[PDB]
Amino acid sequence: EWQENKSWNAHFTEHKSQGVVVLWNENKQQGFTNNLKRANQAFLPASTFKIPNSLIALDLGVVKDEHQVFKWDGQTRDIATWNRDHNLITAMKYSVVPVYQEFARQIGEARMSKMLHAFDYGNEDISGNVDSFWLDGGIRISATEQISFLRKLYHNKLHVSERSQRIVKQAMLTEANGDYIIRAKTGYSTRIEPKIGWWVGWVELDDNVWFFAMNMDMPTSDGLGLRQAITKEVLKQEKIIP
Ligand SMILES: C=C(C(=O)O)[C@@H](C)[C@H]1OB(O)c2cccc(F)c21
Numbered sequence: 001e002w003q004e005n006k007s008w009n010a011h012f013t014e015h016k017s018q019g020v021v022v023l024w025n026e027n028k029q030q031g032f033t034n035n036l037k038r039a040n041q042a043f044l045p046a047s048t049f050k051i052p053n054s055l056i057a058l059d060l061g062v063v064k065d066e067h068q069v070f071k072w073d074g075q076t077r078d079i080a081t082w083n084r085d086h087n088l089i090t091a092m093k094y095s096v097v098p099v100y101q102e103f104a105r106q107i108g109e110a111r112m113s114k115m116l117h118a119f120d121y122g123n124e125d126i127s128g129n130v131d132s133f134w135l136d137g138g139i140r141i142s143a144t145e146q147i148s149f150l151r152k153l154y155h156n157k158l159h160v161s162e163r164s165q166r167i168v169k170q171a172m173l174t175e176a177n178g179d180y181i182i183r184a185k186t187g188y189s190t191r192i193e194p195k196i197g198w199w200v201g202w203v204e205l206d207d208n209v210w211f212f213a214m215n216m217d218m219p220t221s222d223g224l225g226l227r228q229a230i231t232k233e234v235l236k237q238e239k240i241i242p
Pocket residue numbers: 046047048079094095096097135186187188189
């Protein structure tokens with residue numbers, strides 16, 4: 001049911017990097033990873049939490065639809081794309097932390113905790129600031145646990161509306177062509193060691209879906225593009241994408 005494939009380490013080593021990729025073949029109900037230990041190591045989710053946060057915001061009416069505008073608060077932040085109005089689609093694309101921090105404040109700690117329990121999400125612990133616990137609080141989730149959560153989202157089985165799940169899956173759209181569709185979210189955990197990058201989501205094929213979750217050590221922001229590059233080398237090797 002789980003296979004270790006250490007050959008994927010080469011993709012990591014060729015970029016002087018260390019990390020884990022986890023794949024799940026939905027049709028065959030079989031998982032593969034280069035590191036069975038790290039595949040099950042729980043880390044801060046960082047911006048991958050915008051997936052559950054979006055779902056909860058939509059289901060509780062904090063976000064009405066994917067077109068509602070959240071106006072910039074006028075504070076100039078480091079990331080230039082954040083210094084403008086956003087909707088749910090662009091806030092996911094540009095990973096606009098302050099938008100989601102306000103979502104979390106409006107959700108509140110009681111409802112946030114109850115929903116993460118209902119979602120079976122990671123260690124289910126929201127200790128910390130209600131508007132930053134996914135960055136520097138108590139919540140921890142492993143790559144295999146991310147896959148468990150994403151599979152429920154794919155099949156509309158989370159304990160929120162079908163509509164909320166469809167809208168979040170739309171907002172996760174990252175790449176599509178005549179071979180595949182990727183729906184995914186990146187994450188970058190810098191506030192608490194060890195600094196890591198994430199990419200989690202799935203690849204839709206004509207006749208199967210392959211779920212993925214990867215994380216890797218990320219001592220500087222220079223290597224953020226390796227999150228997608230290394231994952232794509234694995235997907236290419238496994239003939240999931242050409
Ligand atoms: C764009 C991002 C990405 O692609 O990861 C990062 C930089 C962004 O998304 B989160 O992962 C996050 C958390 C704190 C701060 C922060 F700027 C981010």
